[PDB]
Amino acid sequence: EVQLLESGGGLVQPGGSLRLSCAASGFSFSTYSMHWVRQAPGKGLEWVSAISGEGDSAYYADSVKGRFTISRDNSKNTLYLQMNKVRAEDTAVYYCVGGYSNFYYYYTMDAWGQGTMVTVSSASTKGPSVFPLAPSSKSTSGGTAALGCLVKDYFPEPVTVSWNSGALTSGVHTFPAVLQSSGLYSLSSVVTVPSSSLGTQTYICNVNHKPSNTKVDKKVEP
Amino acid sequence: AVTLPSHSTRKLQTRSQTWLESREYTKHLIRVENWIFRNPGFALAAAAIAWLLGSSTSQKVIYLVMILLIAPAYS
Amino acid sequence: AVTLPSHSTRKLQTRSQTWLESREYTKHLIRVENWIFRNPGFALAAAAIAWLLGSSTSQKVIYLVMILLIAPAYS
Amino acid sequence: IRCIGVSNRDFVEGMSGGTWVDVVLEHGGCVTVMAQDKPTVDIELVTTTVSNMAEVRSYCYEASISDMASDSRCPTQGEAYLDKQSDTQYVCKRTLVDRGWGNGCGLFGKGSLVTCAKFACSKKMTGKSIQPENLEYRIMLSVHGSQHSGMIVNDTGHETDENRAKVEITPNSPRAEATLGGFGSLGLDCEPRTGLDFSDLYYLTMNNKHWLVHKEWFHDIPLPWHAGADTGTPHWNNKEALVEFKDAHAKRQTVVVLGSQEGAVHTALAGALEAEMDGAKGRLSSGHLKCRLKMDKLRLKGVSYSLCTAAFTFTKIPAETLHGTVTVEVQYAGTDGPCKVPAQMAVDMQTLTPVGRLITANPVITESTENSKMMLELDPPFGDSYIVIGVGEKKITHHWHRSGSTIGKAFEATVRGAKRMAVLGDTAWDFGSVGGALNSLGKGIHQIFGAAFKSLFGGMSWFSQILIGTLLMWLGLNTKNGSISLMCLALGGVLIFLSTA
Amino acid sequence: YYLTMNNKHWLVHKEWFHDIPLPWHAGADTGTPHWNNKEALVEFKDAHAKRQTVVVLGSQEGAVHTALAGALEAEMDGAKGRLSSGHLKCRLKMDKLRLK
Amino acid sequence: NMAEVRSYCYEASISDMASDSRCPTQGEAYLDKQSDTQYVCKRTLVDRGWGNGCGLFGKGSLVTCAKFACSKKMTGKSIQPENLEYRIMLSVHGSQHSGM
Amino acid sequence: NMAEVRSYCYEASISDMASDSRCPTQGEAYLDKQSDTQYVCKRTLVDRGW
Amino acid sequence: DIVMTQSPASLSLSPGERATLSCRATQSISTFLAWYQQKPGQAPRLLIYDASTRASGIPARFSGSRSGTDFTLTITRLEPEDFAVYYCQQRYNWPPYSFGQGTKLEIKRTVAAPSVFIFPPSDEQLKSGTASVVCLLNNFYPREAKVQWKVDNALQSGNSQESVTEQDSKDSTYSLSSTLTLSKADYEKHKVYACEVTHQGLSSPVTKSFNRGEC
């Protein structure tokens, strides 16, 4: 069926060059023209570049002209979007759109990928910290409130954070990285509590991440 | 290799385009015009010869055309 | 490209050897021989034309030879 | 569908009662066949894949002279001889040089010198052979009929989209039949052996590029060649057409190679057809078929449907598709389901007399939703007309002015037929033929004229045909004799053949 | 003139050299050349008036070696080009040439 | 001391190409990369229709650009007549042997 | 709903111009500013002395 | 130069009513438009081909129309599992096709009272180096607000990094984590802090001007 898998994840440092490789399989992609559509967080979609059925022809947008060149292997039915001269405006989610084209660039029924988290960050190797959050100590003796183990200044995105071995997961969701003034990442969320747990159930977030090695068991303080 | 044969002897006449289609029409005309521009005296050299042949005031132009076309590409 | 002009128009006739001198004599003869071998009917097509022209049984041979030489290299 | 935008679309109308109609499917041209009580089926030849090609004599174009050697002989002391002369991978040439006492010899006169060099081809081109029992003509069939969603993706050549079907034509099975859902089945009678005469065509493979190279041109290249069935280091017969033995002043005989002849052999393909390759099979971009359309099992879908009621919507404002036909899209706003669209071309709107004929015969609304699309095609007459695509009082119309005349379309069809006769030749008499004693005697005398034309001239370029045509025009303009028609018909039959490119 | 092509040289006539249909720049450039008349090597061919191909021809070294029919070749030992042909015109003043 | 003249290219290579299209009677096709001299270009006519993205059937406008890049070029040099250096060897007949 | 066609200029201007010559039998003249499409140019033959 | 503009961008309606979304154009694009359907966190789908015919697996409740350069949607019945972000696309002449802007669909919810959580800055985190005065705002409508931190009777902005959560199924839970990035010396030189809510359901914003050292 419609299976457009994407690869080439991770982060893009300012000054290097990478390749977004879409593993397109399941159709005759020697005739299907391929396209590339961004997804900016907070803004709309952006059109980047596309490759025609004929191998030589390939167009880009005027804002990204002369920077991102694509290549299609007809024996592999794959793409290679060369990410040359990546600036700070390329922090979006790239996709792969494939449709049949009798002419150079056209489609009647469109296909889509799953997305690739491509962000730009210029910082060193940092670990996730445990920042508390708690409501006021006036109506916390039975009711509903909002709190959450805040994880900021981590590198890279994301950090797998749980809440009491999968118990207080009523409002915990994997939010994307809040862009700071540097390459540090941040996330913040709320949660729903029954508030009958101060003294019995500990609010320890298991903040664990592989390439940082920072695990500090801490609790929120009212 | 020097004597490469040209494929215009047995061109495959279909609806589509051949290999050399844009440089097909203005190929020999450019050659004979460039050669007759590089050799100005051979027109008078042919007109001294082709006027002698024919002697019918109409075959002399035919002999002049055939000498002027046999001169750049010799064959 | 296609019409590369030959350098034998302005060949430096000196005592030493040129670049292509061994393949200078048999350069056009192989072309006209291969073209008349690939198309045997054009000799009859030239005999049907050159007999109509000339009208002296001596210029007809010159017409036939120059038509058969103007045929492989079109120019 | 799939043939409505291409400029080389031809309309083949008129049958032998609707039984069969002989047609020629060209590679770039499209064929629209319309009938009396059968739906209009558009045919277009798409690909021509040649599988399992064996190789022939493969030439070399870029050589490389390896480590050479030389040996001289004194005059009146015999001739020169090297140990690497008898090898077949080494080139060799003997010559006569001046030899004296300053060179170490002891007898003045003309000596003997042999320079030997190892011939080593770097990049060779491979010429393959095309067998007539290997052609796989693909034919995309697509009826006009009840068009779905205006235009669908044409990559869905599967069991869905029942108005379209693919037909693969092999000479091992020359008949085929495409099951069109509701429309019945169209039968084909293709003759791929009588196609583009593939016994005299080869297939060159040169530096990731391909061609359709003629056989008589391919057997006459002065380049080093071998058998063909060896991928290692070949024998390379005829090495002397690429190396050059130059002696300056009979003192030193340096053998130098000519350059890479790839640019010299791209310029020698003045009439080849460039093909491509999608794997082990070489796809052509040219050719023509020869197909008879058995239409006995082609029935019209939707004759039993009722008419529409009202409430049409005129989206996608129509245009002329370069032939006088107007492709009209409509949006039936109604949930009646399978209704039949009342479309007709009419001047004098109080009468609504149908003056122009209809291309998409029996148009059918397919979808039973609120807004069901449809794509039609009408042929208005020359002048002013209205596209009335409704009935009653809620009908919508559209004024159309088809510029031209009847004699202009007659001259256009005559020019199109002259180009079709110059391209195809003997097969051009069976492009719209229904069979009889009129489309076969003309084809027979045209086959005699093709045997007396293709064998007579047979080797002329574009320019040489016009050069001898001016001579034949002068022979027709003068030389008052009985043989004055043979020099004027042979002027037109040459100039139309080599002017309408 | 004096051609230079892959460690080979020729004595090429001027009227033959100024009529080559090949892309050229003016010679005074020492960087990326402008390449006047680029339409002699690339070939634009539209397939069926729905797709336009662009392809270059082959390397024209063999086609320009076969076009140098009557040009004498020469060597070059650095900044000087030694010729393998030519002729002089010398008057031999033998007034001071005495017999030894 | 030879001076350089127009230097032709004999071996080329086409870089990344592109081809701009245009609806019929809606203008003409124009590339933004047509404003460089290293891009060869050619204008042509192709068929456009409802399947090709346009709403007007007719002959469209197609312009294909391709970046030209020559890898190996030949260079013509000019010959100044005021810089010829002829070398003449003289040899009298006298006391010399065959190894001289 | 009008779409544009080839749009002509009627009032032009010439910016900072430049010109350079080459010696006779020493090649043809050339500039690096000829390699832009926003520069017009024309080759000619003028007298040259010591 | 053809910028696909969308008007309107949000409609506070109920599931079951109609919704008309229009995309505009500058030049003369005749009919070749394509609508899209993008849920947040999922892969985007289409809605209609040439604003008239949907894809495989999309019902006929959603359609469009053609009116010059404007293309208005016609939705019969709105479902709660259908409210997402929608886009437009250009397919006229030669690419790059121009996308729209993004049209979200909001639903009615409880506009009774927002949250009044202040979070005093948890002094061990202040000794660690950072400062998170997280004035939590939850269960409020609409999602837009103007938080002005009146710190010592002065306007301080430019450092507010909010985090708006997705809409809930029953009450459309919207959050706003207002955070003011301050150092240790900025916390020592400032004493009076004041948070803002700017809730459009009420007639007066609850400005809690709490002092440093309270709860």
Author numbering:
A (entry chain D): 1 to 222
B (entry chain V), C (entry chain U): 1 to 75
D (entry chain Q): 1 to 501
E (entry chain K): 202 to 301
F (entry chain K): 52 to 151
G (entry chain N): 52 to 101
H (entry chain E): 1 to 215
From the paper:
The outer icosahedral shell of the mature viral particle comprises 180 copies of the membrane (M) and the envelope (E) glycoprotein, which mediates attachment to the host cell and viral entry. The main antigenic determinant lies on the E protein, which is composed of three domains (labeled DI, DII and DIII) and is anchored in the viral lipid membrane via its C-terminal end. The E-proteins that bind the receptor and catalyze membrane fusion, are exposed at the surface of the viral particle and the M proteins are buried beneath the layer of E proteins.
Here we present a three-dimensional cryo-EM reconstruction of ZIKV bound to 120 copies of the Fab from ZAb_FLEP at an average resolution of 4.1 Å. A total of 120 Fab molecules are attached to the virion with good occupancy, near the 2-fold and 3-fold axes. The Fabs are clustered next to the 2- and 3-fold icosahedral axes, where they each bind to residues projecting from two adjacent E monomers with a marginal contribution of a third E monomer. One Fab binds near the 2-fold axis to two E monomers forming a head-to-tail dimer labeled B and B’, with just an additional residue Asn52 from the third adjacent E protein labeled “A” participating in the interaction. The regions of the E protein that are brought in contact with the Fab are DIII of monomer B, DII including the fusion loop of monomer B’, as well as the hinge region between DI and DII of monomer A. Another Fab is bound next to the 3-fold icosahedral axis, making several contacts with monomers A’ and C (that form the head-to-tail dimer), with also Asn52 from monomer B establishing a single contact. No Fab binding was observed at epitopes around the 5-fold axes of the viral particle. Fab molecules docked near the 5-fold closely approach inter-raft E proteins, which results in steric hindrances with residues from the epitope, thus preventing Fab (and also presumably a whole antibody) binding at these locations. In conclusion, variation in the local conformation of the epitope that is presented near the 5-fold vertices explains lack of binding at these positions. Interactions between the Fab and E protein on ZIKV in one asymmetric unit consists of 11 hydrogen bonds and 3 salt bridges, as analyzed by default parameters set in LigPlot + v2.2. Both shape and charge complementarity play an important role in complex formation: for example, in 2-fold Fab, the negatively charged E54 of the heavy chain interacts with R252 of the E protein, while hydrogen bonds and hydrophobic interactions are formed by T31, S52 and T53 of the light chain with K316 and K373 of the E protein. The glycan loop region is variable amongst ZIKV isolates and also other flaviviruses, which indicates that differences in this region may influence virus transmission and disease severity.
